[PDB]
Amino acid sequence: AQNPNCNIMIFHPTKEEFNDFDKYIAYMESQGAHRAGLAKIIPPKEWKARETYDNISEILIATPLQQVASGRAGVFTQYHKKKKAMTVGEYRHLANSKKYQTPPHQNFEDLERKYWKNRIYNSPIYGADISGSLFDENTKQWNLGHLGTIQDLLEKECGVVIEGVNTPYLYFGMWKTTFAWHTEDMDLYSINYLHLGEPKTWYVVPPEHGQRLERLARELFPGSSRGCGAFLRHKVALISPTVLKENGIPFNRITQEAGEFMVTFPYGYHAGFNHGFNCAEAINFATPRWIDYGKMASQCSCGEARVTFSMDAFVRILQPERYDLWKRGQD
Ligand SMILES: O=C(O)CNC(=O)C(=O)O
Ligand SMILES: [Mg+2]
Numbered sequence: 001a002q003n004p005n006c007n008i009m010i011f012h013p014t015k016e017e018f019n020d021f022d023k024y025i026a027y028m029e030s031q032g033a034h035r036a037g038l039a040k041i042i043p044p045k046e047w048k049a050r051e052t053y054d055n056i057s058e059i060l061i062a063t064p065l066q067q068v069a070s071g072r073a074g075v076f077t078q079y080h081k082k083k084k085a086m087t088v089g090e091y092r093h094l095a096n097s098k099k100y101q102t103p104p105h106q107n108f109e110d111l112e113r114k115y116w117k118n119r120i121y122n123s124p125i126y127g128a129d130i131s132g133s134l135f136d137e138n139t140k141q142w143n144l145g146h147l148g149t150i151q152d153l154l155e156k157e158c159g160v161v162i163e164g165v166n167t168p169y170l171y172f173g174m175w176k177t178t179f180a181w182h183t184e185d186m187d188l189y190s191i192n193y194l195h196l197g198e199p200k201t202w203y204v205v206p207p208e209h210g211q212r213l214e215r216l217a218r219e220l221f222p223g224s225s226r227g228c229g230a231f232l233r234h235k236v237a238l239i240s241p242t243v244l245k246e247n248g249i250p251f252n253r254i255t256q257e258a259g260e261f262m263v264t265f266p267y268g269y270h271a272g273f274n275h276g277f278n279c280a281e282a283i284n285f286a287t288p289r290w291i292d293y294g295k296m297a298s299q300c301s302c303g304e305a306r307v308t309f310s311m312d313a314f315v316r317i318l319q320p321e322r323y324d325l326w327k328r329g330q331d
């Protein structure tokens with residue numbers, strides 16, 4: 001078995017190997033990358049996502065989200081408070097203000113210590129889930145707006161044509177902006193490209209150990225657990241690496257820098273935080289190996305998780321028994 005300790009693998013494809021996306025994902029998996037739940041892909045030196053980032057300040061963040069925490073330093077939840085619209089230019093200025101900027105620090109490790117110590121006492125503002133793309137239309141390789149669609153993958157594997165579309169999303173982050181512990185909708189893969197700015201630190205639990213994370217989460221968030229059998233779908237719970245180590249949960253950590261891709265694999269729980277002003281682009285995708293995960297994915301039916309139009313058809317075809325109850329939670 002390849003990668004039996006489930007370590008995060010880092011890949012360095014040649015320009016030749018960067019031509020065929022599907023084939024490279026399949027290569028990574030042949031080397032055991034999926035066991036970790038997350039992989040890093042450094043693009044060939046000749047590759048670029050676009051010529052410059054000089055003209056992005058007029059992008060609108062229609063609903064910036066202030067991330068308000070409750071709980072203790074290592075075990076907390078966050079809620080999102082809606083703020084007034086601002087442009088990317090305005091957001092970058094805010095990120096760099098004395099109130100929100102990254103603090104002095106020695107290295108990534110010191111910054112990580114400071115995040116876990118202090119996150120709960122601040123409320124950073126995140127520009128999340130903005131439909132759109134920063135890839136140049138002439139970038140032919142690993143262009144997240146030109147991937148094969150999940151709907152076409154399900155059609156090719158299962159023979160059923162379904163409605164729905166699949167487009168990327170932009171994330172504008174600042175110091176301490178946080179992504180809570182989750183897997184993707186329908187336990188899909190995701191791919192994330194850090195276009196610019198400061199890094200993003202990731203934590204991941206191997207897919208083979210996801211249920212251990214879920215059990216710990218039920219113990220640490222006992223009211224949430226009673227309210228919904230899949231409350232991590234709400235994307236609000238944070239658990240520190242110290243707490244995970246104390247409870248014997250297997251996980252790994254890695255820092256992503258500007259110009260690098262991360263891939264999350266089906267049922268790989270992940271969480272993390274941004275180091276300072278940055279812009280990431282991400283999209284879900286599928287492969288033939290995903291189908292069985294899709295069929296088994298948990299769902300939130302309490303009504304909190306509230307998801308896209310396109311997830312309907314996935315639930316309808318892959319999880320017909322669940323479909324009825326899950327749509328009640330959607331409506
Ligand atoms: O970048 C973020 O805030 C969160 N991204 C993801 O969870 C992802 O790409 O799967
Ligand atoms: Mg602009």
Ligand code: NI
Nearest residue numbers: 183184190264
């Ligand atoms: Ni994710």
Ligand SMILES: [Zn+2]
Nearest residue numbers: 228300302304
């Ligand atoms: Zn729920």
